[PDB]
Structure 1
Amino acid sequence: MARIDPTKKGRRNRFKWGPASQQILFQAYERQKNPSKEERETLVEECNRAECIQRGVSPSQAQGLGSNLVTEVRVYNWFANRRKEEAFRHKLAMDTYKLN
């Protein structure tokens, strides 16, 4: 009984970002720090491109990644990590370790 059922989302295991993908995330940070539109929408594409290459998946089906599909909510998540990585510690101010 009880069962494991999805909460919402967070750090899914099957999902990875990826090496090139880290570069992608950083080179979003290069441009824009308040994720407005094109930026992010771009970012998902940019990323999907970089991810599909790791699998030799067709560009016109880069989302075929499937298992590790960089959907919007993932990118939304990472920026919403970064600003929370502030917000937590920004409120506590005694919690440099144990995840700011």
Structure 2
Amino acid sequence: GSSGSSGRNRFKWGPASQQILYQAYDRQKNPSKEEREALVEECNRAECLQRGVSPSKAHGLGSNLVTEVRVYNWFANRRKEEAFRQKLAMDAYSSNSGPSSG
């Protein structure tokens, strides 16, 4: 499939890629096929440059290859964490109504 196939694997962002994600997230919290994509190619590209590799052979990155999914996950976590500090407040014994739990 085009930058998408059943086969979860351990992957870690890079020094350049990550930054790219932030620059995009700062503008749009929910990037669409267009927004996200711009990060899939941009990242894989910068990754090849910094790593000396070519931006036209990212396919090699393999475990270090970025795909619509990768960006989808990163953005998902960036939104889940920011809301966390607030989600943990909705619980009981807080400045808002909510059920008890321990």
Fold in common (TM above 0.5):
yes
- Structure 1 Cα separation of the partners of residues 50 and 83 of structure 2: 34
1:9–1:87 Cα change, 3 Å: farther
Q: Secondary structure at the match of 2:30?
A: coil
Normalising by the residue count of structure 2, what TM-score does the alignment of the two structures yield? 0.67
Matched, 1:92 2:99: no
Normalising by the residue count of structure 1, what TM-score does the alignment of the two structures yield? 0.68
User: What residue number does 1:24 align with?
Assistant: 20
Which residue identity is paired with 1:49? Answer: R
- Structure 2 Cα separation of the partners of residues 91 and 76 of structure 1: 21
Alpha-carbon RMSD across the aligned residues, in angstroms, is 2.5
Q: Secondary structure at the match of 1:52?
A: helix
Which residue identity is paired with 1:34? Answer: N
Query: Which stretches in structure 2 are left out of the alignment for 5+ residues?
Result: 1-6, 92-102
* Offset at residue 56 of structure 1 (A): 2.4
Matches within 5 A, 1:1-100: 12=10, 15-93=11-89
Q: Is the 8 A contact 2:45 2:56 kept in 1?
A: no
Q: How many residues align?
A: 85
- Structure 1 Cα separation of the partners of residues 47 and 74 of structure 2: 16
- Structure 2 Cα separation of the partners of residues 77 and 63 of structure 1: 20
Which residue identity is paired with 1:35? Answer: P
Which residue identity is paired with 1:86? Answer: E
Structure 1 or 2, whichever has the larger Rg, is 2
Cα distance per residue 1:32-65 (max 9 Å; x no partner): 1221231111111110111111332222222311
* Offset at residue 28 of structure 1 (A): 0.8
Identity among equivalent pairs (%):
88
